[PDB]
C-alpha cells in the first residue's frame, strides 16, 4: 500500500526571510541566522501562497511518509528560535555537601565553560565546555538556578544534557542519594 | 560495440561489484581498461555492515607461518577493487595472467591520465540502480579505518588539479563564444545556394 499524495504546510510570519536551494534551508531574521541540511530526505518544496510553504511526497510507503511530519516541525523550530530564542533552567539538589559552580567568561573563543566543585565532597574539579552560540548565566532571581539561552534548540538542549549527565553517583542506592543537577523548565527568551 | 585503443573510466559513483563484472569481461576480449579515482566507489548498505564483513576477512591467516601462503590483506582503495576483479578471472593460467596486464588502477588522477576524456559505464551507476531512501557507504572511508595512511595527501593533490582545470574552462568557453559569432557572420554574407542544399540533406 503506497500513498499517492501526502502534503503539509508551514506558515511564515512577515518578519524574517527564508530561502531553500538544493534541499539546504537558510533562515534569517531579527535575532540571527541558522542553516540546516536535509539532503537525506526526498521532499519536494514549493511556495503555496504569499506566506505559506508547502512540502509533499509522491508514491511513498508507510515508513517513508512517517518522516514527513518530522521535517515540518524541525523547520518550524528554526523559525521560532530566530524570532523568540530558547531558555532552559536548572536546579541544584544536595543533602549535605553544597555544590559550587564558576561560570568563567569566554576562553579566547566564543565557547563558555562551567566548573563544578565539591560534588558529594569529592576533590575532582570537573569541567564542561558549551557549544558555540550558547551563553550560561548565574541567576539572580533566587537561589540555585542555572539559565541557558541561545538561538537553536538542538545546541541549547544538548549542552544542557551534558551538565546533567556528568553529575552521577556510583556504587550507591540512587533512590536514597538524590544528589545532582537536573533540568526543571523549558521556554523561550521572549514571553 | 566499438574497438578503441584504450578507454578511461571515472570511478566516482560506481557500485563496486557491478563495475568489476563489466571490466572482467572486456579484459578477456582484448580491450584495455584504466580505472581512475578508485577512492570514490560505492557499496550498498550501511557502513557498519561493510566493516563487519572486512573484520571477518582479517581473521584468516596461516597458522604455522604468517609470512607465507596466508591471505595478504591489502589496504588501499585501488587494491580492494583489484581483489574483486581477480576473483572473476582464471588468474592461475597463462591466458588469465595475460588479461591482468591490460588493467591499471590509481587513486586520484595521475599526470599521465588527466587531460583525457573519461567515459562512464551506465549499468553500474548508483543513481540509476538503487531505490531512493536506501543507505550506502564509500570505499574511501572504509580504507581509513583499516590502516590506509595517505588519505589526506590525495585530498590535497586533488584540490590542486581541480583548481588548474578551472582556468582551462575559461579558455574553452571563450573559444566556443568566438566560433559562434564567426558562423553567423560568414553564412549570411557569402553562400547563395549551398545553404538550402545542405539543409535538405539533413545538415
Amino acid at each position: 500500500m503506497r500513498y499517492i499524495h501526502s502534503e503539509e504546510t508551514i506558515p511564515v510570519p512577515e518578519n524574517l526571510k527564508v530561502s531553500i536551494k538544493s534541499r539546504l534551508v537558510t533562515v534569517e531574521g531579527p535575532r540571527g541566522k541558522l542553516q540546516k541540511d536535509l539532503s537525506h530526505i526526498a521532499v519536494n518544496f514549493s511556495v503555496v501562497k504569499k506566506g505559506v510553504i508547502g512540502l509533499e511526497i509522491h508514491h511513498g510507503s508507510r515508513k517513508d511518509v512517517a518522516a514527513l511530519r518530522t521535517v515540518r516541525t524541525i523547520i518550524n523550530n528554526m523559525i521560532i528560535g530566530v524570532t523568540k530564542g530558547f531558555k532552559y533552567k536548572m536546579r541544584y539538589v544536595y543533602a549535605h555537601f553544597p555544590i559550587n559552580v564558576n561560570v568563567e567568561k569566554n576562553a579566547e573563543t566564543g565557547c563558555y565553560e562551567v566548573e563544578i566543585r565539591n560534588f558529594i565532597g569529592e576533590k575532582i574539579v570537573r569541567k564542561v565546555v558549551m557549544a558555540p552560540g550558547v551563553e550560561v548565566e548565574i541567576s539572580k532571581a533566587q537561589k540555585d538556578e542555572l539559565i541557558l539561552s541561545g538561538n537553536s534548540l538542538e545546541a541549547v538542549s544538548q549542552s544542557a544534557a551534558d551538565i546533567q549527565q556528568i553529575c552521577k553517583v556510583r556504587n550507591k542506592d540512587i533512590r536514597k542519594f538524590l544528589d545532582g543537577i537536573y533540568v526543571s523548565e523549558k521556554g523561550n527568551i521572549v514571553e | 560495440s566499438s574497438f578503441e585503443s584504450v578507454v578511461v573510466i571515472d570511478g566516482k559513483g560506481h557500485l563496486l561489484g557491478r563495475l568489476a563484472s563489466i571490466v572482467a569481461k572486456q579484459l578477456l576480449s582484448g580491450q584495455k581498461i584504466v580505472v581512475v579515482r578508485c577512492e570514490a566507489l560505492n557499496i550498498s548498505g550501511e557502513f557498519f555492515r561493510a566493516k563487519l564483513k572486512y573484520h571477518a576477512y582479517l581473521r584468516k591467516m596461516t597458522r604455522y607461518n604468517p609470512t607465507r601462503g596466508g591471505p595478504f590483506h591489502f589496504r588501499a582503495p585501488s587494491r580492494i577493487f583489484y581483489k574483486a576483479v581477480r576473483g572473476m578471472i582464471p588468474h592461475k593460467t597463462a591466458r588469465g595472467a595475460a588479461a591482468l596486464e591490460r588493467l591499471k588502477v590509481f587513486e586520484g588522477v595521475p599526470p599521465p591520465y588527466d587531460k583525457k576524456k573519461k567515459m562512464v559505464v551506465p549499468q553500474a551507476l548508483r543513481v540509476l540502480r538503487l531505490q531512493p531512501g536506501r543507505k550506502y557507504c564509500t570505499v574511501g572511508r572504509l580504507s581509513h579505518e583499516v590502516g590506509w595512511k595517505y588519505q589526506d595527501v590525495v585530498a590535497r593533490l586533488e584540490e590542486r588539479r581541480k583548481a588548474k582545470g578551472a582556468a582551462y574552462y575559461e579558455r574553452k568557453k571563450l573559444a566556443a563564444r568566438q566560433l559562434s559569432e564567426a558562423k553567423k557572420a560568414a553564412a549570411a554574407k557569402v553562400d547563395p545556394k549551398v545553404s538550402e542544399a545542405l539543409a535538405a540533406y539533413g545538415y
Binding site: - | 597458522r63 604455522y64 607461518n65 604468517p66 595517505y150
Partner: protein, 194 residues
C-alpha cells in the same frame, strides 16, 4: 610516501669523508668529487644556485649531511661516519638558509643538547655467536637423568597442527641486534679545553 629530488654538496671535502666512498683507498686515484667541484667558479656557480631555489619551491622537509672527525680519537680507524639530521624550524626558506650557511664548519654538542634533558639512545647490542634455547629464551632445564641432552625443550608441538610453529623457542643466533632504548637523562656536559 616521501622521496628526495635534489641534493647539493660543498666545494671542498676532507680526506676523512672521501675514504667512505672507497673499499681500497690506498691504490685508488682519489677522484671522488673532482668533476663536481668545477661546478663552482663556473658561470659564478649558476648551476648550484638553481638547485637551492628548487628546494625552496617544492620541498616540505629539509635534512643536513654531517660527519665526525674520527682523527681526534684514540681509535685506529680512519674512515669517518656519515648520516642525515633533520632540521625543525620556522619556515622552509629559513631551513635552507640556515643549512647552507654551515658548509664546512664545525658544530659542538653544547649547541644541540643542554643539561638535564631526557633523550634516547640507538645502537647495536653486544653479540654472541650461536646459542641454545636455555640461554636464548630462558626455559627450564630438564632433570639430571635425561638421556640425549637436558638443555632443550621437551615438546615442540601437537599432532594435527602438523608443522613446527613460528611461536616455539629454538636455537640460533643471539645478540648483535638493533635496539632503541628510551628515556635517559643527562647530568653534565663537559668541555674538552677545561
Amino acid at each position: 610516501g616521501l622521496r628526495s629530488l635534489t641534493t647539493v654538496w660543498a666545494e671542498h671535502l676532507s680526506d676523512e669523508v672521501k675514504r667512505r666512498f672507497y673499499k681500497n683507498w690506498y691504490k685508488s686515484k682519489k677522484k671522488a668529487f673532482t668533476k663536481y667541484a668545477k661546478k663552482y667558479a663556473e658561470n659564478n656557480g649558476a648551476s648550484i644556485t638553481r638547485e637551492l631555489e628548487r628546494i625552496k619551491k617544492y620541498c616540505t622537509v629539509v635534512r643536513v649531511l654531517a660527519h665526525t672527525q674520527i682523527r681526534k680519537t684514540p681509535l685506529k680507524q680512519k674512515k669517518a661516519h656519515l648520516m642525515e639530521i633533520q632540521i625543525n624550524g620556522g619556515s622552509v626558506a629559513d631551513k635552507v638558509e640556515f643549512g647552507r650557511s654551515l658548509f664546512e664548519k664545525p658544530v659542538t654538542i653544547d649547541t644541540i643538547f643542554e643539561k638535564d634533558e631526557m633523550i634516547d639512545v640507538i645502537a647495536v647490542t653486544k653479540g654472541h655467536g650461536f646459542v641454545g634455547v636455555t640461554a636464548r629464551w630462558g626455559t627450564k632445564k630438564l632433570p639430571r637423568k635425561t638421556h640425549k641432552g637436558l638443555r632443550k625443550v621437551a615438546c615442540i608441538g601437537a599432532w594435527h597442527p602438523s608443522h613446527v610453529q613460528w611461536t616455539v623457542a629454538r636455537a640460533g643466533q643471539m645478540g648483535y641486534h638493533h635496539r632503541t632504548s628510551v628515556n635517559h637523562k643527562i647530568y653534565r656536559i663537559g668541555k674538552g679545553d677545561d
